[PDB]
Each structure stands twice: as structure tokens, then as C-alpha cells.
Structure 1
């Protein structure tokens, strides 16, 4: 979708391994702000609003 017409998914009920997400090499630009990318999939996050 477009940027103003941005689509939001509320992702719930996960055993979410994000370490294989950014280690897929198709993703070019990756950053994170309050959590480092090292310790994402060691925690609980209550949701993903993507």
C-alpha cells in the first residue's frame, strides 16, 4: 500500500523469532530504536503493530 494509506496489522499469539528476520539478506535497511536487534527474540512484546 501507499504511505498515507498505510496498512496496519495487529499481529498476535506468536512464538516470534525475529533473529531469522533480519538475518534474511533481502532486507537492506534495518534499524531498531529502543531495543537492540541482538536481544529481540529473547523477550516478550505483547503485540506487533506492523
Structure 2
């Protein structure tokens, strides 16, 4: 992972946004969503991610 002063970024496109895959990363500490419900993530489709 990159340092915070020089954070990295990757463009996501042309894929299926399955968010259950990344729910096996940790016991979980911080998980917050803005403008979108945690329940509608596996539903909505975005132009630029």
C-alpha cells in the first residue's frame, strides 16, 4: 500500500461490481457509505469508479 502523502489510485470499468468478495478481509473496523446504502451496492451501476 502507498503512503498517505502519496496515495495510489486505480480506475475500475467494464466489470461486475460484486461487493461480497471484499467482505472477507477483516473482523471489520470502519465501514461507511455516502449517498448509497450498503444494501444497494450489489444493484446499482456506475459510470466512473
TM-score, reference length from structure 2: 0.73
CA RMSD of aligned residues (A): 1.9
- Aligned pairs for 1:1-50 (under 5 A) are 1-22=2-23, 24-48=25-49
Give structure 2 stretches of 5+ with no counterpart. Answer: none
Asked if the contact 1:17/1:41 (under 8 Å) is kept, the reply is: yes
What number of residue pairs does the alignment pair up? 48
Farther off after superposition, 15-24 or 26-35: 15-24
Question: Cα distance, 1:27 vs. partner?
Answer: 3.6
Question: Cα distance, 1:21 vs. partner?
Answer: 2.4
* Structure with the greater alpha carbon radius of gyration: 2
State the distance in 2 between where 1:24 and 1:43 align: 22
